[PDB]
Design a protein around this ligand. Structure first.
Ligand SMILES: Nc1ncnc2c1ncn2[C@@H]1O[C@H](CSCC[C@H](N)C(=O)O)[C@@H](O)[C@H]1O
Ligand SMILES: Nc1ncnc2c1ncn2[C@@H]1O[C@H](CSCC[C@H](N)C(=O)O)[C@@H](O)[C@H]1O
Ligand SMILES: [Ca+2]
Ligand SMILES: [Ca+2]
Ligand SMILES: [Ca+2]
Ligand SMILES: [Ca+2]
Lengths: 231, 233
């Protein structure tokens, strides 16, 4: 339905970006994790390889050390994060499906960065409330990546603006939702796509008016909105 | 005379319009919006950095805590003003452009923003300025951040100077690396002869940058394509 679409004007340009600039810079275990995942039935949930390099560039430019990832799946962006962080970096990875994670776990292990990862098999919302209860100022995160159930993004935001340090970054994936967010009405979507589509329009509008953060909506992948905490 | 000026890399004008009106304009500094609306009246307004790309550059600058930057290709100063507003109050920018009169169009808005003091505008071709910067720069003065948005067929020449003028871990950004999507094909019909030279140089630069061990890169399909390079050694 929506997964067949690109935000760029042609698949030729997207493949040009992937082949010229993405794959030649892809870590060998990241390539292996993607190629196994591509044969999985839910391979459409995979974060694009060009977005992945953009994620690690942010992580290194901002010198992130402690990050949280919501929505792991087979672990492409998680492995991308663990490779970008220094060897003493630490990641809190939350996903409901442990089996999805164990698909990519051997490649995280072969990369030697499993020690940076604390995987939590849970729904994300209770974990964040739990983290709110037992965290103080020097446990705050530098970086957060939200890539899970779309209709819960606004709930994650209310908790992540407190679990991320001042000056830290929160990133929301699929904010352009295959272009469908550009219109108030959109024909012929299945109810789950329409729920997510309406949730992103409210989220994009809300985040543009949120005095707690600066934002930057980036037209990469399916849309990523970078949020930097102000206070 | 340039044919690709109005071509979008996104799939529809409405999607770009949505991004600008939802996420770009509501977060645009009033003097940045003032400068853009004046520039869009000007002849070569096509050279203006898109507003959604402006907030991306600003976001990069604050996250990486840049304090000393260099800007190659100023025009009326949209990305320059974007940089000056993002940098700390004691920040420093070296801005280079052949055209001083273009800069003076946006200089009133840079002044009303209170950030002119951070800017050292140099009216010159960039290559001679970079070559003399190489002579008199100690490793304490290396720039954190370089934005290249000038003559496209010179990007590779600038690259050899900027890998030495930017600190290790610093960022070098190349604008227009997608050239309106025309880089996706070996040949592209009906371009200005100057347009084609730029199209061929970006294809060479994109392949070269992907194999350059001195930097890690990420090509971002925002605006007309931005390639962030991070110096490794
Ligand atoms: N409520 C919830 N709590 C935690 N994880 C959830 C969740 N709802 C959905 N998810 C998970 O979020 C994932 C989204 S796909 C994420 C892709 C991954 N970031 C990559 O790099 O490819 C799915 O694996 C799903 O199991
Ligand atoms: N060789 C050269 N050295 C320095 N500047 C040059 C140059 N060749 C072209 N330029 C300048 O580079 C500019 C490119 S347009 C740059 C737009 C600007 N960065 C913005 O934010 O809108 C033009 O103004 C042109 O005068
Ligand atoms: Ca489970
Ligand atoms: Ca996603
Ligand atoms: Ca001149
Ligand atoms: Ca440009």
């Amino acid at each position: 339905s929506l997964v067949h679409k690109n935000i760029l004007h042609s698949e030729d340009l997207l493949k040009y970006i992937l082949e010229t600039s993405a794959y030649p810079r892809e870590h060998p275990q990241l390539k292996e994790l993607r190629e196994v995942t591509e044969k999985h039935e839910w391979s459409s949930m995979l974060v694009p390889a060009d977005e992945g390099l953009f994620l690690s560039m942010l992580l290194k430019l901002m010198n992130a050390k402690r990050t949280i990832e919501i929505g792991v799946y087979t672990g492409y962006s998680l492995l991308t994060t663990a490779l970008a962080l220094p060897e003493d970096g630490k990641i809190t990875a939350i996903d409901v499906n442990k089996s999805y994670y164990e698909i990519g776990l051997p490649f995280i292990q072969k990369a030697g960065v499993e020690h940076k990862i604390n995987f939590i098999e849970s729904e994300a919302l209770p974990v964040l409330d739990q983290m709110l209860e037992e965290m103080k100022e020097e446990d705050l995160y530098d970086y957060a990546f939200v890539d899970a159930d779309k209709s819960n993004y606004a709930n994650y935001h209310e908790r992540l603006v407190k679990l991320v340090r001042i000056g830290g970054a929160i990133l929301y994936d699929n904010t352009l939702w295959y272009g469908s967010v550009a219109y108030p009405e959109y024909p012929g979507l299945h109810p789950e796509e329409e729920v997510a589509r309406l949730s992103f329009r409210n989220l994009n509008t809300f985040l543009a008016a949120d005095p707690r953060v600066e934002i930057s909506q980036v037209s990469i992948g399916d849309g990523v909105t970078i949020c930097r905490r102000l206070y």
